[PDB]
TrEMBL record, chain A:
GO molecular function: metal ion binding
SUPFAM superfamilies: FMN-binding split barrel
The keyword Metal-binding is annotated on this UniProt entry: yes
Organism: Kutzneria sp. (strain 744)
UniProt keyword Transmembrane helix present: no
Protein name: FMN-binding protein
Pfam family, one: FMN_bind_2
Keywords, sorted A to Z: Heme, Iron, Metal-binding
Ligand binding (heme b): 66, 68, 71
Length: 212, 213
């Protein structure tokens, strides 16, 4: 489980799915053997592409991911590893200068999703190639420029042996939406207004604008 | 090696890892879950030892300062001398093969990461807790802030202090992923760098690519 103070809960389950879709390069964590620090790999993870219809909740759905099979994290997972995948969205430092109140302390507004469950390794070549093609389809659509993978499928197949594809059955899903909900209404407005004025912070202002 | 980093994605200089830690202080702190559970992950503000003089070129051997909420189960979970990783995530951008203008190809994600490992030591004294949060204001307000003066709030910090869980992390191992199209042919790296220079969202990635030898 993930610690999320009451005020930082998403208004709706759909916000956690939106952050996963918007920020697919997750930090995949699993336990380190013999009391060592956890293993951490940045990996591209998407929602099950076979899910037709609105996906409102992460709990009960399967995420699809891959990493490098030669990455020692792949061997360390073994068979039924309990893992967390952390998705990190828009974030910005909050200067109390923005509050125009006193006294105060600074903070950092940020967005995260933590999904936990059992990681199963894909061994099937068909399921592995489906994983990377669904990942092209999902990320090129949201982040890309209309690139057509069709002419590169032979190439995908040539490099496929190196792919460690996986499936993560989401047992638990938690979302930090730390967006100044602890402040009084006028101060939340001052913060939202200050973040509206620059590209680095507009995405945070966007989420703050959608709070009930 | 505790973090997997293909040879092409090694930083040019140890200083690049220190730069990313300074630029991206909101780290993800990870420690093992009890009895096969998944790791505990908390976003925590972390800075370089403010007492360091000289140029800081290497993370290994320096102490990082940070805090978290004592009310967070992760605080009780860390117990004594917990082995932890703190991951710092810098500039990043999806790479469309449309930018490469080459075939065949596969998309990728250019990103920067630093993973530091060592033993987390808790600070229990109020005087070391207070130092931790004051040092953190001085380091972050200067770099990310808008000229706020903490002077008027110094007693306020003491009046809201018990909830702070301050810690020290002596860096035993530091690894850095600088995934910035080094695997592509030079003409293609240039195409990605020029593409990423044409939008604010991707400019920081272009800037790192421009600083590669
Ligand atoms: C669509 C976007 C994609 C992204 C963001 C992406 C991202 C990544 C990342 C971050 C890793 C490294 C994980 C680790 O450190 O262990 C990786 C490894 C790998 N991916 Fe993907 N991938 C994508 C599509 C593909 C496709 C379509 C293929 C086709 C087969 C592929 C083949 C590989 C291979 C072979 C590796 C092992 C490392 C290597 O030889 O380059 N990826 N991918
Ligand atoms: C300068 C930038 C600062 C940042 C970016 C920052 C960030 C954070 C974050 C992310 C947490 C939550 C950690 C968790 O989930 O366990 C935290 C907790 C906390 N911080 Fe800070 N902090 C800052 C400065 C301060 C200062 C100056 C104080 C003064 C006492 C302070 C007091 C606290 C307290 C009491 C908590 C416990 C939970 C709460 O009451 O919000 N912080 N801080």
């Amino acid at each position: 489980a993930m610690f999320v103070p009451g005020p930082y809960h998403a208004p709706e389950d759909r916000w956690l799915v939106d952050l996963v879709r918007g920020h697919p390069l997750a930090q995949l964590a699993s336990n380190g053997a013999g009391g060592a620090a956890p293993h951490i790999t940045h990996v591209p993870i998407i929602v099950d592409p076979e899910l037709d219809g609105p996906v409102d909740r992460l709990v009960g759905i399967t995420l699809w991911g891959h990493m490098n099979r030669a990455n020692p994290h792949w061997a360390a997972l073994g068979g039924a590893a309990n893992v967390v995948a952390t998705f990190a969205g828009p974030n910005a430092y909050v200067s109390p200068a923005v509050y125009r109140t006193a006294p105060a302390a600074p903070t950092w507004n940020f967005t995260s999703v933590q999904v936990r469950g059992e990681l199963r390794k894909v061994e099937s070549a068909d399921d592995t190639l489906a994983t990377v093609r669904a990942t092209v389809a999902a990320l090129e659509s949201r982040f890309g420029a209309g690139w057509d993978m069709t002419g590169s499928l032979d190439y995908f197949r040539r490099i496929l042996p190196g792919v460690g594809a996986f499936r993560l059955r989401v047992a638990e899903a938690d979302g930090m939406f730390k967006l100044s909900q602890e402040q009084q209404p006028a101060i939340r407005r001052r913060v939202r207004h200050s973040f509206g004025g620059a590209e680095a912070t507009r995405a945070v202002a966007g989420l703050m604008d959608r709070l009930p």
